[PDB]
Each structure stands twice: as structure tokens, then as C-alpha cells.
Amino acid sequence: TADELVFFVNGKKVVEKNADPETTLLAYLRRKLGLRGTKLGCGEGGCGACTVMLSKYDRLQDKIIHFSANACLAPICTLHHVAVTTVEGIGSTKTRLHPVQERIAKSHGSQCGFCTPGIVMSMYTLLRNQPEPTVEEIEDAFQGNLCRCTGYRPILQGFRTFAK
């Protein structure tokens, strides 16, 4: 007889009464919750298209912590009492874009657009931990994100505006 799985997505409570241990967060977001901003690019942790932010109250540090994770590899069964933030949780064209989203778009950092949600979430996570990053911290933030279209220069240029 199974326990309920309880987590949050974009501030909203999810009660999953019949969690399957095999279910990934990416599958859950896209196919149960209908939040399709987060993408599948490889399923093996190398491309970052599925990048989300995770938050929890770490009982051992007595502190709220925020970090990035590949939704394609995160079992939902690891997420009890964790808060998930996806690209649609930080801004939209129907409300207002987040500065991260505005800057990558206006700086010509998005061509086909398929990698853009993952990169946005990598930058957002950095700013959530460090609102005054250095140029150096900004490049290291993207080792887990691949883009086939842009050659990366415009993405870094637009984001460097957040530095120091």
C-alpha cells in the first residue's frame, strides 16, 4: 500500500497518489502536467535541454537551497517535499518576461529556440544563488547546456550584462 508523493511545480502543490518509481520528472512535467517548455534533447544528462531549478529546505543546513538539475534523469520519487521551477514559472509573453528571458531573446541568443529554456534555467539558477555574479561564474554555469545553432557568442554577450 503506497504512500502519496507530494511536491511543488511553479508554486503549485502536486499530490501524486500512485507514483511509479520509473517515472522521470521530464515525463511528469510534459505528459502529466502539460508543461512542455522543458524539452527532451538526449535523455542522458549531456545536453541540458531538460534543465529545471529545484528548491528545498535542507534540514541538515537549516537553509533553503536552490540548484539546477536535468529533469530527464530525476526520478519523481526523489522529489518528495521539493519545489520544481520550470521556464514557465519565471515569466511569459502573456504576463511579463524575466530579465533572463528578455536578454537572451533580444541579444540574438535564440535561433531554433530548442535549447533556450534549458539555458534560461541554468542562468536563472545562477542568479538565484548569486545575484551579483562575476563574468567567470557566468560561463561555468553552462557546461551542461548545448546549442547547435548560435555558436554561443550572443548568449554569453547578453548574459555578461548581469556581471559584477
Place this chain on the structure above:
Amino acid sequence: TADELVFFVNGKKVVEKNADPETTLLAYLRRKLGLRGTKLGCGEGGCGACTVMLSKYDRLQDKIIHFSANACLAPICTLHHVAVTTVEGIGSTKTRLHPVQERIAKSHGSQCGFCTPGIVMSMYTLLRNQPEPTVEEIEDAFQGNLCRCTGYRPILQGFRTFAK
């Protein structure tokens, strides 16, 4: 603690484990089974757009009986061990049309087509009871079917070919 409802649609077994007494056969056919040949035209028994054939074994008469019914008013809960036949159960353009279907089409008995399934099922039911009906039996078969387009003449003329 509810019992299972078991019936048949076009020769296929339906096992409803959670039947709602308020569910009509028309709603079940269209919105659970996805058999959309049977139409809603009034929901009050007057138009026959939702006509299907029901078959059951009669104990008192010691035979299988066949009769027509308005799916819009048939509770699925009355149908335990009854066999339902819809328009898709008698023929199709992907396999072979039933004679009733071919004749109404070729005789100009179908304009917008919305009443055609119900009329087909009324004529089909008659022929299942009486393979050689009289002209008089043919018109009576349709007191419960309305058509707004044809003025009825071509439908009766086409089906007259089954008579004598």
C-alpha cells in the same frame, strides 16, 4: 461496492467496472468508446438520430430478439447482457457497405447526412426481424426518424426495393 456492468457493442465485450446510472448509451458510445456514427439531435426521443439496434435472448419467447432504441434515453445500466449494434457494426466504406447503406446513398436519400445513421439503423432493424417486408411495414419503420433535407421521398423509394 458496485457490480460490473457487462454488455456488447458491435460484437465486442464491454466491461464497465464503474457504471454511473445517469450515463446514457449515446454518451457512452460517443465519449467512452469513440464510436461517433450515432448522433445527438434532440436528447428527448423525438428525432431518432441516435437510433441503435438492441439484441437480447428472450426467455418467455425462447429466442433472440432484435429491436430499435433511442440511445439518447437508454441508461447503460439497463443493458447488462444486451448486445448493441450501431451503424459502424453493419458495414463501412473501408470494407463493404451493408445493402441498407448502399441503397440510401445511391438513391439520393442522404443530403447533409446527419439523420442517415439513425434511418439506416431503423431500416436494418426491420430487415433483421423481417427480411421480406411490405411497403407498409417500411414506412412505419420510420415514425421515429426526422429528416430536414430530403423531403423523405427518395429514402422511401430507395428502400422500396427491399419490399414485396
Place this chain on the structure above:
Amino acid sequence: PKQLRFEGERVTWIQASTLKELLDLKAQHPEAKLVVGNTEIGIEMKFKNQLFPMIICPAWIPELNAVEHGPEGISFGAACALSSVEKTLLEAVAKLPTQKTEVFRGVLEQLRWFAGKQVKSVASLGGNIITASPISDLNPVFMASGTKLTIVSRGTRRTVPMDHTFFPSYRKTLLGPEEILLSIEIPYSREDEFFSAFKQASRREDDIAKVTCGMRVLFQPGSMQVKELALCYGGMADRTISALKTTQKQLSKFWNEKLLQDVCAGLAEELSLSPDAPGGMIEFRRTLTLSFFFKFYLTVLKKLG
């Protein structure tokens, strides 16, 4: 927290709240599979069609997440994320004298261009170790440094330094069916002790034929005379290995051109690859084992001077 049970089509998952629970469940079901970050298990299930009908997640257990500073080194619970290890070691390097942080600096070098922030935030330290990939960038450093592993089951507890014997065969470690890795102590460097780590800049096969290494030398006090030498390599076999035959021969020798010659001759022989060895790149890999040692040799000379 309390223990949770989730039930799927094929898999039962137990979220263990305490160490006692974990050891009880592992005694009750020795075949139960541990999962922390799932960065290896997820790949096994999806791509190698492995199925583990019982999974235990120990991520919530305090003991598996503890970071402890001791007289001999820094102890990390086995569920600590690599990002946390990296942060702790960077702080240690920043505050402690260079001579004490030679092993830490080696770990940090191996973590430098190692997966994104996403992977490092959930990949556990113990997970990398027990995964036991021939091309783990971490196990060569842990082997060369004699990093101590505390291993526990219901009614057992033992602390062993990692050495060549810890990886008996492909993807296997010297753990019992019931045992779990509790904590990992990365040692302080001593006086007259130096360390380097290097890795190949390319990978062409899933888990073989990427050269990666840890190298340690301990000299007799104030000397250039070798007292201990350890050179451990991934990507040269089906497990992490130590060039023991080569290093044993250098004991009491002095750190000079003759030692460079002899070690290079030893490595070429001891780590020799057949023309048809899995992963290919035969010449390149041999050249790297020697080139990495050369870099270590020069670096140790600069540290000595």
C-alpha cells in the same frame, strides 16, 4: 521524516529515513538497489535495459550527507553531491597551506571540466565510486591517495583505504551483497608529499579507453629519495588499476632522469595494450600514460625547488 513506499508496474521504491532503516532493509533484501542521484541507474535502466525490482533511496539519511573535518582529512557522506564536495574542497584549498591540500587540488582538477552544474548538483560521491566505471576520473585519485572508505551493514562496520584490490573486476567493488558505503575520507597531504591528477580530453566509448590518473609521491624527510610512489590509471583496462610493479621498483631511488627513464620503461610494459584492445587508440593511450607521468615528474621537481 518517515519511511515512504512507492509501487510501480515493475519497481518498488523505499525512501529510507534513517541509517538503521537502510541497514535493516538491506539485510532483508540484499539484492535491493541503492539510488541517490540516479545519474548512473537511469542510464542502466534506459540504455542497458537493466531492471532492479527493488530500489532503496538513502538520500534523506543524515550520516550519508555529513561533512566532517578530522585530524587526517575531510570526510564526506556517500550521498554528498559532487557540487558540495567541490565547494568544501575549494574552501579548504583557499584557507589551508598548500602542503596540506595536494590531494584536494587533485580532486578539484578532476572535477573541473566534468559535467554541468546540473549533473554535479545531484551526482553523489559514493555513486561515482561504487559505479566503478573503468573511466571514472575520481577512483584513480582515491586509489593513489589511499582515500579511506567506511563500509557498513546490519552488524558490521569497517574502514579500508582504497587500493588496487578494491576493484576486483569489471564494474565490481569489494563490498558484500548487504554492505553500503557510508563515508569517504579524503586525506590531507603530509610534508614531503606531492600529488597530481590528469585526464584525457576526449571520450569515444561509453565506459572504456579514456586515460585518467592519480599520482602520489612521498619522499624520505627533506630529501628527493622516494619512500612511497603510487600511479593509478583509468581507461587502460576494465577497471581502475595501479602500476604496482613499476612503482615498487623505484623505492629508495632519487627523483632524477634515471627514475624518469625507468618509470617510463615500466609503464610502457606494465600497461601495454594489445593491438585489438577494447577502445582502440592504442598508441595514443600509451603515449598519454607516459606524458602524464612526465608532467608529474616536472611538477614534483618544481615543488621540490
Place this chain on the structure above:
Amino acid sequence: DTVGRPLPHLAAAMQASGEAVYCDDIPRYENELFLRLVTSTRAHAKIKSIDVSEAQKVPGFVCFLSADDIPGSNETGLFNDETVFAKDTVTCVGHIIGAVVADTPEHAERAAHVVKVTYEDLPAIITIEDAIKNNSFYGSELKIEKGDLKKGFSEADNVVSGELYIGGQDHFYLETHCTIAIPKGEEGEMELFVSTQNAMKTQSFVAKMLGVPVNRILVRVKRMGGGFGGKETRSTLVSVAVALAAYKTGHPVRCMLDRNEDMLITGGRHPFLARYKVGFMKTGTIVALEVDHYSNAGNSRDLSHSIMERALFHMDNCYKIPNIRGTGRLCKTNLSSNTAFRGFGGPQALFIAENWMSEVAVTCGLPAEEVRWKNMYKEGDLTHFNQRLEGFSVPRCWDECLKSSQYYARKSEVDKFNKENCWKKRGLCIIPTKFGISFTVPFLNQAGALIHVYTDGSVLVSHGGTEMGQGLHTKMVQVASKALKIPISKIYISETSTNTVPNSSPTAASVSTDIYGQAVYEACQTILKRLEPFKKKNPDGSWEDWVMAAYQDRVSLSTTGFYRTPNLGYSFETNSGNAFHYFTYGVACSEVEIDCLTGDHKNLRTDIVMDVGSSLNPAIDIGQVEGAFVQGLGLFTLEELHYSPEGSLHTRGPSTYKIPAFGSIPTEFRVSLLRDCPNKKAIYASKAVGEPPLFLGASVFFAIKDAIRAARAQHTNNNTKELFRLDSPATPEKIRNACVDKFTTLCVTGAPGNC
């Protein structure tokens, strides 16, 4: 008028917010099913049995589809030499044998893995060498010849001959192949949503497999998360399978490939082997060239022939060669069929050209830039295929790149560095390129549009081209706005669809802006012609006023537009007629530092000058230059596909196949568009930009080769005119092995050695 302004890509904000819809983002129907391909694990074998008994046990399993289920035809592919589903024999690892259909993609995946296939191996051919030895080719030799090779070689002071190999490339679009197919249940009707550059062939191939007329099939393409040529034809592998599932079940069905499936099944860039011989003077002037090209085509023809034609058209790069013979052969092998990839045979031929040119310079003991400049075409020269070079801007790009990159000063610094460092070396190279613009098949150089102006004055544009991130819809909106003299805010493009513009060519060859821009322009002209009387009657009224007046006077506000590129048609049997409309040109200079002990390297600085005529949108064009260059840098230096001896791909995802990362790009990365160079031959004086810059990535390769030469001077021997073979990609393995020293030779161990 926004033409020439750096307007952001129209969907950029929605892409950043995760609101832009890609194929798999489309909501699922209540009854929609999922397909997973079942694929060969053998390079070449007879199929003896397919066992689905274990797959039927998987919860949610619907059916297994194979060849016997097809109602129409199992014959498919551009040249009708493929199967939809393999029947008796498999001819590559990854060869599609059938498909599982299930209620979830997880269930489909589970079921597909437990389908058991039994095989009987047949002799396989995997490498180009295998193919040559076995005479295993598609069709006959392709050739272009000009001048007198004997005579040319007689007059030469020096002759250099060699062999060279360039590995292939996986597209690695971030969005893999995907199709949704919706059967209507009437008259064979089906509506498909597909990530494809080729809605027309998708439509035809589906219709052919089903055995229904083409008019029954509607194909819709909103956008792709990248194509790069890999969705020009190979997308039909998934589309046709999913269409069959839809037909068979009567349910909607979809499939999106996992990365590992996509890399195995869908084909990549063609590997090339070249055998070459060049004759040259002591000055470095070229007098004779012979090159035999061989491509690894895989297990069907697909676009292999046209790819080799383009290779042969670019074997000159930017150099005048009076006596020349190039040939090409397509190798038939038991590997997934290779296909279009950005550059389309061009980068391979250009790489081969720059390789022997590099050896000419070394042999003559002259500076490479001097030798390249000396041999460059001039304005008005004929290529080896006898096309005149009109508007030849390479000399301008060259001069400006030399100046802005400070080439000569940086060359001295490179020499200084190499003087002072033993185990690290720097290299620096400057490389030109020209790229012919047009499909080499004349009939594909046609384009349609359809424009409607609604009674509120808003305009809906439809054209044959597809958006894959290159900003085509953006540019078409900019063109329509300029043509009609209304704001971009009044114009919209929703998608590409076979029921708005029929018979479209694939979105390819870098010409979409040129041809759809013309089609859109012409349609706009027709609209203006119709509105002119209303404008005349009300010259101070608004667009809206004119549109409403026209509507009330029963003037049609809907029109087609069409364009066909004029004066095209090259003959191999005369060596005359225009192969291309014009050429796009550019120059790149790159500097690298190599670690001689490890084979790792740093990209220090790259400067690019590109002739794109008068850019419709400099932000988009600079983006295309940068993106293309980085893909070329990947081809030449990072990306390596690796196969078992049995012909099975080992490198099936980002852990084992390394595309350029954030940290891979040149530390200083500069791109300039050449000024004051209008192109009379295309829309609003612009030039095609998509593919031409990719080969410039080879500047990194030749910088690396320069650095290796320095390492060899340091530790290998004393022969400054030595030619060593360096194949592509120049991976750490190749770089390290080339720096021959006391380690590679084992001289450090006390052994005698070749250093």
C-alpha cells in the same frame, strides 16, 4: 522599412519563455498512441524470424507493424531503392525492420526492447577501402576536366601526391525527428504535423505507402528545433512509419526519436577519401591538379549523387588551376544512408583543396598566405566548370581580414611563442572560401507563395519554406513589410503547409531567402496593383481604408506569387552552362595553442569577414556566420563518429560524441559583414548565408596543423619541408600522435627511436 535592420527572430521571446510549440509539444488526442521503431543490430544479414511474444506481455501494447501491414507500397526513398520496413534482409545496423505501437512512449520503448530478431549474417562492406576493393558503388564515375593534365604536370617544377580522409558528422539538431499523424477516417484523409524541411516529399512518400492520391494528405510544419540538412529527406523514415500506424489503428499516433535512435538511424554527413596529385612551380603557382574523391554513401542513394556534384564544383576553392581533373565515386556500404548536411559536399571538397594548398606552401618553403593570394582567381575568371566569377569579393574580404585580425603582427608573436616554449606551440592560419548558390538540380530552383489580406488590413503570408531557426519567416515578414509599405506588425506567418503552397522544394541549398523572398515580393506586387485604383481615389487614406474599399468593390485580396531562378543548367557533357546563380564569399583567420604532451588545444582568436551582399537582417546573418563556423569547427576538430569492426555505431549521444560546447569557442571571436557590396542577383541586394560560412571552421584545423609543424621542428626531425598526413577530425588523438617525440617513440625508455 526594416530591411537591413537587426530585428530579433520573430519567435525569440516565445522560445525564451517555453511558449513556442515544437512538434512533440502539441497536445495529445485522448486516444493518441505512440510508435517506437524496431531496428537491425547487424550490418548485413537475412532476417530469419521476428518474435513479438514478449512484447505482447507489456502493459499497453497495441500491435507490431511490419512490411506485410503496408496497404500500398513498401518501396520508398528519393530513388525508390529503400524499404519502409525491411522484409527479407537488413543492410545496416539501424535498418528499420518494424515498429511497436503502444498507449505510452514508455510502454512502446519497453515493448520494442524485447522484440527478438534472428539473423543469418552476410558478408558486409563498411569502409571506403572495403567498397573500393569490392567495386561496391552507386552509378558511374562523375568527372569535371579542363585543360591538359599531361603537359601541366610536364611544366611543373614540383609534384606532390597523397591520400586524405575526412570523417562524417551527426547533425545533432537539439530537437530529434518527430511526427504526429492524424487519420480522419474519410476517404484516406490524413493530417500530419512533422519536424521536416521537406513537406512535399513527406506528403508524397506517405501517400505512396498508403496507396492513396497525394491530395488526401496534408502536411503541416510550424517550426523545427534545427534541421541542418538532416530533415531534408530522412525525416520520412519516421513520418511514413507513424502514418502506417495511424492508418492501421485508426487512432492518432506520434513518435519522437530518442538521441541514440536518431544518431543510429537517420544518417549524417558523408565521410570522404581523396587521392590527389598536384603540380606546381617553385613560386607556388599551381599548374596541374588531379583528385579522385570517394564518399561513403551508406545503404541507399538518397542525396549522395548531388552531394558529389557539389564537391566536384568546389574542388578549386578560390584558386585558378589551368589543368584540372576531378572525379567522384559513391561508395555503397552497409551503414545507415548518409544525407544532406549544411554545406552538402562543399566542406569536404574545400578541405581537400586546402590540404594540398597547405602542402604546396610547405614544399616551396614560402608563407602560406602568399601562396594562397598568388593562386587566387581574379574578377571575371572562369572556374574549372567554366562559370564566370562576377563580383568576386574574396580579395576584399582577404585584405580586410588581414588588417582587422592584425595577421602579420600576430604571426611574429606566434613565432616568438614557439621560440620560447618546448611542450606547447601556437599556430595561425588564414583561409578563403567561395560557395555556389543554387540547387545543382535545376528544377528545384522554384518557389511559391500565397498571400491574403483580410478586411481589417491584416496580412497572412504563406510560402514554401520552413523555419528551422535560421530566421526565414522573420526575413519574409521584413520583405513583405518593405514591399507593401506597411509595418511588420500588420503581417503574420503561421506555418508551412502543403494545402497553401504545393510542390515546394526542400528548405535547403541556402537559397530560401532568395527564392521565397522573390515569390513573396511578386505576390505583394499583385496586391499593390489591385489596390492602386483605391489609393488613387483616396491618396491620404490609410491602408485599412484602401483594403475595405477594394473589398466592397469586389476586388480579390488573395494572390499567389512564384519565382524560378533564371539561366541555370550545367551540362557535364559540354562542361558549360551556369551551375549557380552567384557565389557567396568569405575569409577566416584563426589562432590556436596546442598542448604537445596531451593533444588538447585552446582556440585563442578567430576573425571572419563575410560577403553577404546587402544583408536583409545583419543580426540574423551574423548569427548564421557564427553558427555555421562553429559547426565547421566541430566537423574539423571535435566531432568523431566511431564504429565497431562489425559496423555498429559506438558514439550514440553527447557523452561519446562531442559537439562544440560553450567553452569550445574562440576566446576572441570577431565577425564582420563586408560593406558596400550589393548583390544585383537576389532579393533587395542580399546573398545566401546559411551554408557558405561552415567551411571557414577549417581555419582552426589549419592553425592546428601549423602548431603541429612547430612541434615536429622542436622534437621530431630537421626536415622543414616535411609533409605529414593529418586527417579530419584533428582530435586530441591525432594531434598527440603527430607530435612525434621521446614519448611517442619510447626513446624516453632508453630505446632507439625516430626522433
Place this chain on the structure above:
Amino acid sequence: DTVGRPLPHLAAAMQASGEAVYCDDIPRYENELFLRLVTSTRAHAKIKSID
């Protein structure tokens, strides 16, 4: 040339078979919702409140 001939309505066979698709016959998306109008019960009136 069929102009002037009594060709049956092109969709008649599919209409007789229930294969012809009308608006509500279109399958529903997984997330598709249903609307019902709320309507006046008075010929002419001020709306005071809606609960």
C-alpha cells in the same frame, strides 16, 4: 464529363456508414474542456447579481 448527370452526393456513402465527420465527431484533446451557455430567463430586466 458528368455535368448534367445524377451523380450521388460525394459523401453519401460515408454519411450512410457513420464515417463522415461532423464537428462534435472530431476527437477530443486530452486536456479539452466543455462549455455551456448561461442564459436569461426574463424578456427584459436589469441584472442585479450573479451567484
Place this chain on the structure above:
Amino acid sequence: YTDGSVLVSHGGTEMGQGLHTKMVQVASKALKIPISKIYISETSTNTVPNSSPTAASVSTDIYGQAVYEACQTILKRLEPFKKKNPDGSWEDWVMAAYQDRVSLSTTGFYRTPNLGYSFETNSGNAFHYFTYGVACSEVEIDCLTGDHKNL
């Protein structure tokens, strides 16, 4: 399309009156090809914009003319290929046209001439023409009930 199959779209909608049937008959006559090569799938605002409602009984008249005009445009474009291959098939001619980069897509349009009645001058044509008919009916009434039979 390049198989010779034809897709017709027009501003009119099908409500049971057989408009698409008639449009297919017209297209088949105009193009001189069998009705089996022609299809009408639906009516849509992204294929034919600014359409009048399907009303006033004139849909056959006006969409028939529009379809006829588009068909004539197609025939004109195909004519040279017919002349090069006079023993050939429809399908052969269409493929020849495609490969010679001749467009196989066209619009058609019709505007009814000479309409414009004025209520302030009582002149100008209100209608294009008039349709006529006569009916004779016989009934029997039941004077006691008000029922009747249409005989």
C-alpha cells in the same frame, strides 16, 4: 500535385446541398479529367479569404465560376507540355510542367456583373436572373378534427 491529383478549395461550405459535388463535377468538366482525380477536403479562411456566407442560393453560380477560372489557368499552363507529348497522360504533362518549373497552383475569382439597385431611383438590377416554378396540390380535410391528408 505531382501525381496529377487535384485539390480544390473554394469559399463555399457544404451543408447537404451538394455544393462540393457540383464543384468537383465542374472542375472535372473544365480540366477534362475524371472526377476521381479531384478532391475537396474543407472550407478554410487560410485558403480562400474574405468569403461571403454560403447563402442566397448562388454558391454553385459563383464558386462554379471561380473554380472554372482557376481550371482555365491550369490548362493554359499545361498546354505546352500537352503539345510536346500529345500521346501522353495527364500525369505525364503535370510532371513535365513541374520539372520545367511551371507553377501548378492558382487562384480563381468571380464578381457578378451589373448589380446595383437603388431605393432612391427605383432602378438598377437587383438580381442577376430569376428562378421559376409552379406547384399544384390536393388535400382532404377532416372538418370534425382539423386533421388533413396531403393527397
